[PDB]
Amino acid sequence: FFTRNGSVGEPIPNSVSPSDFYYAPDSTQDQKTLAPSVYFGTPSGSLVSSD
Amino acid sequence: NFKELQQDRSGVPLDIVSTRCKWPDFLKMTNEAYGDKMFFFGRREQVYARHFFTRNGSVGEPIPNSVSPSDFYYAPDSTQDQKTLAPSVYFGTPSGSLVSSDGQLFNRPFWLQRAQGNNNGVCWHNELFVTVVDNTRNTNFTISQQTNTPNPD
Amino acid sequence: TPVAKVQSTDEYVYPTSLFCHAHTDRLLTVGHPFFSVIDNDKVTVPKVSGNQYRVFRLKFPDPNKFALPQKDFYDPEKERLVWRLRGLEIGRGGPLGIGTTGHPLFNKLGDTENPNKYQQGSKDNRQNTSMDPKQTQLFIVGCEPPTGEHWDVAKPCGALEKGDCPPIQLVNSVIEDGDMCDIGFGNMNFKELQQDRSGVPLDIVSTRCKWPDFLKMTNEAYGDKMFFFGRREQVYARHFFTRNGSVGEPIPNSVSPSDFYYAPDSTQDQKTLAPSVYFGTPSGSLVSSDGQLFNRPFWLQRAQGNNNGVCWHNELFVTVVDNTRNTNFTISQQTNTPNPDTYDSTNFKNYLRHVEQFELSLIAQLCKVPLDPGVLAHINTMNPTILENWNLGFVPPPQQSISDDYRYITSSATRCPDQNPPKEREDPYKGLIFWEVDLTERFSQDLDQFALGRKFLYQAGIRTAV
Amino acid sequence: GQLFNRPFWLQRAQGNNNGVCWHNELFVTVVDNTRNTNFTISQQTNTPNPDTYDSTNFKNYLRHVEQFELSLIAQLCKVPLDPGVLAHINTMNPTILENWNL
Amino acid sequence: GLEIGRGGPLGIGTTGHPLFNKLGDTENPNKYQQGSKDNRQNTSMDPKQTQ
Amino acid sequence: SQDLDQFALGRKFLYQAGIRTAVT
Amino acid sequence: GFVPPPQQSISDDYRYITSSATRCPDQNPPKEREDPYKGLIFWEVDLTERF
């Protein structure tokens, strides 16, 4: 499960639907900027079987 | 209800952090007297725990100092490492395993011969509700755009 | 004199064609998954975990006091009635999901699945370690409470020194509501066998994990503890870990694979032997809706034992474990002030809550027992409380006696008349805790109107009258 | 995937001995690696009194407990020992006749 | 007819050697390793399942 | 013992062969 | 002239009744089927296997 790199096309809205509140990590010197929320999985076709 | 139960707004991923996750009330819809809410249904659910994590925050209920805390019982007060307990609010990261073509519910005709309740497929009011969840085709396609011009090398 | 050789209920219990439906409205319970929250004494939030036994004690209405319209099918001078369980459904309401348990201070030294180099030892090497337990589903139904087994501390035949290994004994007990199921660390008394209090996760560290004794429950003479059961259980070893502590039993200095002595004398780092006390973390893999025991009707045609589903005493015990809906929901509350614009970890109080949901539905058949001398003697030898509950035995031995009835009982010109002594003393299962369900006011003859009822009618053919 | 806790009815054996328990003996050979849970139990023997966890303190042990229960259904069979059956049994295993008589 | 009763709960137990003869992991090695006197390690495993 | 129905395997053997104990 | 009592007669027999940590030899009190000739010495002759 990976991320993408690039300019954000659509940023995360300022409101958090789980908590019903706005959120920002402005109290910390790390999280102040969001990481890219553009996720992608790598597929995997599992075991190939003769049956 | 993640909106009113988790004011942290950061306890579950973006698509559900502000939504309500509902499960179908099979017990109530089945025990309805006329049997109108559903007269046929199917389900295939599966999950395993992929990763096991903690929650960061102020502890809401401290672990009791008796045998209810397990290993954290016997206070490591003598040892500068383990004086303060790690958060005992664990959450697992879910994972729906391998999607297969064999396990597919959809793209098959169903014949409603005998319904579950007393309503045997009568579409009262000229109306019918079909409820579908299919988490086996949930692949999100990554798009890109070359906004700053296709010119540079 | 009377009889030997326990006979089937099908020989002295005559069925009728009268079937009744009875069900619970919906049984919900909300609690904490690991430990009960108290203030200091009174329980504020109980322990509700998805790895507990749910032992429902179902109470039936006495069929001998049912006002049937024409009672001419049975004689209350020579006959008595009983309920026989014929259909059942154990409904389960929550979504499928796996919850995890852990200990903030677990006795785990290292990971010995693959060690990049040899290791060390100090004081308090405990770690915060969580795990998903073994997956277990079971259902037992009977007219007596289930028997569970676990390994416990016994008294040795001589004295030992301080820190010696406690001797094991297999201890049978009743399984109660809120007892813990086995989770992959065995069936053992963690409170007595592990004085560390850090050897297993928080929800079991002080509990007794019990397993149903199927070997004793099938091999009992009358077959009353269970007359039907289903079970599914799955586990694999997820990680492979080591204990920390003083090694109670050393490894023997002789190596039986090579027939030689061995010591790491040539290698300075390996001279002190690393702990050979290993443990795996269990893991109940992928849960599936295909593998589900519950939300299915079960028709009890032929019981396992000689009790063919007869609910003696108007009682039924339904014992459920469902480790397939053990999703613990993580709650959070914003304390102090609902005004900050920046996230702080001190601003939020994290909580855990587990919610279970059950719905129980049964089809009971009325049966008549004609109480002839040999049937009476056999029922009395099997269980005296049956012939006490049903008015017939204990014909009245003494005669009348004067009690002299002193007119002014609270005067000082006579002796003290105090007597009035007895509090009611009936319940023999009072020391045990069950999820008591009352179905006395829930019996109905209109099977067509209920989901299990019409499932029973469809299975038996028997369509409703038009 | 369990093999155990199930009745197995010996209708016909694999070989020429159709379930006959010669010499009044039966061998039952079981391996069961699906119940190999080692119960890790510790004792506080060097630690009565302390309210702070120490490692020197607790003595760790390992234990394992097996439980078996074997049930069988035997049938009585009779063998009429003529010259041909006696010589055939003597050829198969002399100990059978030496244990009986004849 | 015969039946073999089995009483304990299901479960997998692990075993190991405190001084097991392993030099290195060869499933995925990042680069070349080394070696000396007494390279033994504490290593546990779950055995083959057999009934 | 010859009283087969008294034991779990013995009544399983009886159920398998039909062979039910005579009702007294 | 005796029925089975409603309690049952399942005996718990340990395989190593001399070992430490199993409580007792379990059978001190001679309650059931003791002849009153316990106090008298006779030349006890067993003819059970001699008929």
Residue numbers in the entry:
A (entry chain D): 256 to 306
B (entry chain C): 205 to 357
C (entry chain B): 17 to 482
D (entry chain F): 307 to 408
E (entry chain F): 103 to 153
F (entry chain F): 460 to 483
G (entry chain A): 409 to 459
Task: Tell me what the authors wrote about this structure, in their words.
For each copy of L1 a loop of the C-terminus forms a connecting arm by extending to a neighboring capsomer, forming a stabilizing disulfide bond, and returning to the donating capsomer. The secondary structure of L1 proteins take the form of the ubiquitous β-jellyroll made up of eight anti-parallel β-strands (BIDG and CHEF) with loop regions that extend outward from the surface of the capsid and constitute the majority of the L1 hypervariable regions.
Here, we purified a native mouse papillomavirus (MmuPV1), for which we have used ISECC to obtain high resolution maps and made a comparison for the first time between native papillomavirus and lab generated capsids. The subparticle refinements were recombined into an icosahedral capsid with 3.3 Å resolution overall (ISECC_Recombine), a dramatic improvement over the original 4.4 Å map. The high resolution of the recombined map allowed for the full asymmetric unit of MmuPV1 to be built for the first time. The L1 protein structure was reliably visualized from Thr16–Ala481. The build of the L1 protein revealed the typical papillomavirus secondary structure elements of BIDG and CHEF anti-parallel beta strands making up the L1 core within each capsomer. Each of these loop regions extends to interact with a neighboring capsomer and these interactions are stabilized by a disulfide bond between Cys 432 of the connecting arm and Cys 173 of the neighboring capsomer. Despite each copy of L1 being chemically identical, there are six unique disulfide bonds that occur, one per L1 chain comprising the asymmetric unit. The resolution of the map density for the connecting arms ranged from 3.3–3.8 Å with some spots of weak density suggesting that the connecting arms are flexible.
